[PDB]
A paper describes a structure:
Triptorelin is a decapeptide with uncharged N- and C-termini pE1–H2–W3–S4–Y5–(D)W6–L7–R8–P9–G10–NH2 that contains three aromatic side chains (Y5, W3 and W6), and three ionizable residues, R8 and Y5 (pKa>10) and a histidine, H2 (pKa=6.1 in water). The peptide conformation switches from a globular one at pH>7.5 to an extended one at pH<6.5. All together, these results show that the peptide conformation, the peptide molecular packing and the assembly morphology of the triptorelin self-assemblies depend on the protonation state of the peptide single histidine, H2.
To obtain insights into the nanotube structure at atomic level, the peptide was crystallized as used for amyloid structure determination. Small triptorelin crystals were formed in the presence of phosphate anions that are larger than acetate. By optimizing the crystallization conditions large single crystals diffracting up to 0.85 Å resolution were obtained. The high-pH crystal structure obtained at 0.85 Å resolution reveals a histidine-serine H-bond and histidine-aromatic interactions, whereas the low-pH molecular structure demonstrates these key interactions have disappeared, likely in favour of cation-π proximities. Hence, the 25-Å-thick bilayer observed in the crystal structure (fully compatible with the 26 Å determined by SAXS) is essentially maintained by aromatic stacking, as shown by the side view of the bilayer and in agreement with the low β-sheet content observed by ATR-FTIR. The histidine tautomer in the crystal and in the nanotubes is the τ tautomer. Remarkably, the histidine residue is part of a hydrophobic aromatic cluster and its orientation is locked by two strong hydrogen bonds with the S4OH group and the backbone amine at distances (nitrogen to proton) of 2.1 and 2.21 Å, respectively. Finally, in agreement with both ATR-FTIR and Raman data, almost no direct intra- or inter-molecular hydrogen bonds stabilize the peptide conformation or the peptide packing except within the type II′ β-turn induced by the (D)W6. At high pH, the monocationic peptide with a single-positive charge on R8 is coiled at the level of the five contiguous residues H2–W3–S4–Y5–(D)W6 with five intramolecular interactions among them (right). At high pH, H2 is involved in an intramolecular interaction network, that is, two strong H-bond H2–S4 and π– π interactions between H2 and Y5 (intra- and inter-molecularly) and between H2 and W3.
Residue numbers in the entry: 1 to 10
Write the structure that this text describes.
Amino acid sequence: QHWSYXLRPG
C-alpha cells in the first residue's frame, strides 16, 4: 500500500 514501507513483508 505504500512504497515507503521498503521491504516490510506485504
